[PDB]
Design a protein around this ligand. Structure first.
Ligand SMILES: [K+]
Ligand SMILES: [K+]
Ligand SMILES: [K+]
Ligand code: NA
Ligand code: NA
Lengths: 4, 11, 306
């Protein structure tokens, strides 16, 4: 899970 | 094409 | 007043040598793409059906094809267990997406078109990076073949469906399930897609039924019947350029058009000579494309005045  | 009846999805 | 449509046959597109599996209009309105059991993608003019080119490279039949948002790329899903990303202008395969362990059945780009989602007979949904062709996530999504996958309008959600009778909604960024929609029963779910306003999901089941779901509230709002759909994974659509319709193929060789609000059948389009496996609606004009299986193998373009 990443924060664009 | 798997999409192009019932026999494959039940095999 | 909200009058019934009058779709009429304008063109018949021949050339595939086996059953057609999927047709899709390019977002810019200029092109139609078709995929087939004959291992080929063909490109046609969206308004006149003019044959444009054949795109080749898969080793087995193709079950689905989908356009990028800028209409420059296609992705295809094949029995050869791969997806391929294509440059439409050159016809060249840019990337081959390897990872599924059985037939790849369905595919789509997200709106930004940096990701592809796929569903397979291996019961998984995969999320792929377009630029690298690498698989980013494998979702253990279902317990039977995955029949459809579709991103919502900002790419933050994926909806998937399966012969296992489930429709599931996934968070793209994490790959975790947000919601399962089940009904009073679990017939196979053969098709799903988000609506053009992002608010609803249209779902087909192999009990001759289509349903419109409010996915936020998780409830069914409308049911559409009268067609034949017990065997094949048939594409359905929202038509929004004129009157607000639901459009679907049928196993009685017809295209069915329903009034979305009243659920009445307003038109049945006659002409195909085998199951209408796929329909598509043009993005700005009142134009429908339909395609049929082995005994027909053609694509038909229909136009309405409303
Ligand atoms: K192009
Ligand atoms: K699974
Ligand atoms: K017409
Ligand atoms: Na519109
Ligand atoms: Na056949």
């Amino acid at each position: 899970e990443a924060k664009p | 094409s798997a999409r192009a009846x019932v026999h494959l999805r039940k095999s | 007043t909200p009058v019934k449509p009058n779709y009429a046959l304008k063109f018949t597109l021949a050339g595939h040598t086996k059953a057609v599996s999927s047709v899709k209009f390019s977002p810019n309105g200029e092109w139609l793409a078709s995929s087939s059991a004959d291992k080929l993608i063909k490109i046609w003019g969206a308004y006149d059906g003019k044959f444009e080119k054949t795109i080749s490279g898969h080793k087995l039949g193709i079950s689905d094809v989908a356009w990028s948002s800028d209409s420059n790329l296609l992705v295809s899903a094949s029995d050869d267990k791969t997806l391929k990303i294509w440059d439409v202008s050159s016809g060249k395969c840019l990337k081959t997406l390897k990872g599924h362990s059985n037939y790849v059945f369905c595919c789509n780009f997200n709106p930004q078109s940096n990701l592809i989602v796929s569903g397979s007979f291996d019961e998984s949904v995969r999320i792929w990076d377009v630029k690298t062709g690498k698989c980013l996530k494998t979702l253990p999504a279902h317990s039977d073949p995955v029949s459809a996958v579709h991103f919502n309008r900002d790419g933050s959600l994926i909806v998937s469906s399966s012969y296992d009778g489930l429709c599931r909604i996934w968070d793209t960024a994490s790959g975790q399930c947000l919601k399962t929609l089940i009904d009073d029963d679990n017939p196979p779910v053969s098709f799903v897609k988000f609506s053009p306003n992002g608010k609803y999901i249209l779902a087909a089941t192999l009990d001759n039924t289509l349903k419109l779901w409010d996915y936020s509230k998780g409830k069914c709002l409308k049911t559409y019947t009268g067609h034949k759909n017990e065997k094949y994974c048939i594409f359905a659509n929202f038509s929004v350029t004129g009157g607000k319709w639901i459009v679907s193929g049928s196993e009685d060789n017809l295209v069915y058009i329903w009034n979305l609000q009243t659920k009445e059948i307003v038109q049945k389009l006659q002409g195909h000579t085998d199951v209408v496996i796929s329909t598509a609606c043009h993005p700005t004009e009142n134009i429908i494309a339909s395609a049929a299986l082995e005994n027909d193998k053609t694509i038909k373009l229909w136009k309405s005045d409303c």
